[PDB]
Amino acid sequence: GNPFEGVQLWANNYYRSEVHTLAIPQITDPALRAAASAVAEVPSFQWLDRNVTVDTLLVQTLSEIREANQAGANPQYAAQIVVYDLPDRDCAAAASNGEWAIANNGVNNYKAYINRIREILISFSDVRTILVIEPDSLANMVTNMNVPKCSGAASTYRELTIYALKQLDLPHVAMYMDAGHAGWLGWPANIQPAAELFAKIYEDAGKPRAVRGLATNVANYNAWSVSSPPPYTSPNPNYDEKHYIEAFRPLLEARGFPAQFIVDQGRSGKQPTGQKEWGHWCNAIGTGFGMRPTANTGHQYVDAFVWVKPGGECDGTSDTTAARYDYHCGLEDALKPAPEAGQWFNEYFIQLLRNANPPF
Ligand SMILES: *[C@@H]1O[C@H](CO)[C@@H](O)[C@H](O)[C@H]1NC(C)=O
Ligand SMILES: *[C@H]1O[C@H](CO)[C@@H](O)[C@H](O)[C@@H]1O
Ligand SMILES: [Mg+2]
Secondary structure (H helix, E strand, C coil), X not given: CCCCCCCXXXXXXXXXXXXHHHHXXXXXXXXXXXXXXXXXXXXXXXXECCHHHHHHHHHHHXXXXXXXXXXXXXXXXXXXXXXXXXXXXXXXXXXXXXXXXXXXXXXXXXXXXHHHHHHHHHHCXXXXXXXXXXXXXXXXXXXXXXXXXXXXXXXXXXXXXXXXXXXXXXXXXXXXXXXXXXXXXXXXXXXXXXXXXXXXXXXXXXXXXCEEXXXXXXXXXXXXXXXXXXHHHCCCCCCCHHHHHHHHHHHHHHCCCCCEEEEECCCXXXXXXXXXXXXXXXXXXXXXXXXXXECCCCCCCEEEEECCCCCCXXXXXXXXXXXXXXXXXXXXXXXXXXXXXXXXXXXXXXXHHHCCCCCC
């Protein structure tokens, strides 16, 4: 029942165009150019991180995949999409690019967004669609409830996640709820509380057929599996995603949720990274493209290794005077200067390409 099995993952035209038009022209090394062409074809997720993407990007991606499939793709292509617009988004962050607020009709705005997405998915029932549900949402309920915006948002995040899990429970869809990463929920003291939270949400949503499990390391740089713990992970015993998931799954399964995982490895190629501290998530230096997306992970609990955050697209501006500035993007281990979040960051793309592992 692995949704990644028996299909090819669609490598979208937006990311392809960014590499061909923004990156390649500026690369002098012939070897780096050839590798950039290859990276352009690696299928990464696309994000519905703003309401305007629903009637644009989403429809365009599904339309393009249908056309490719109707022309004979074999195996058929499947879509990889991130749902990321909860109101009062990123409750514990220093800065957030979310557009809606709970105190200003955010629940009704989010329900309508989920409803329109559902309508579009129903209209593309011939396109297998894999979704990552809301990164940096429920992981905050495990450890960041001391932050007032997070304790104030908790019930809404729970209710709206349940709403999304049921409304997007469609026969051709597979959903993975975000579950932070080893350096967030993988610490031994956070494992069980996290397992209690995710298994209860699953149960409370009626164990929807489409809910396949959880996604980890989204937009982070952790290794899947390395023999030695990177210094900035100490003293966490679960220093990589394999350690985190091997400890987490049994607790989830005992509580009624035999969650299968997908793990982001888009920026996990070079280990250790250049991060000075594990919580430094913005445009981290000393990182490289990691294992390519695949359904053949060699691990019973992991449906696939994926590229969720498209390496080369910025995490946030380093301009300290900008409205959306997050201080994490101005730290010593964040590559600067950096453009606005989501915009092509060619200097970062080149870094990832040079540090790729395995190499392209
Ligand atoms: C979200 O976009 C939809 C169209 O996809 C539009 O009808 C709706 O008004 C938007 N929601 C808000 C709160 O602006
Ligand atoms: C292509 O050429 C230029 C000039 O030597 C370098 O800046 C680059 O690193 C690459 O070798
Ligand atoms: Mg083992």
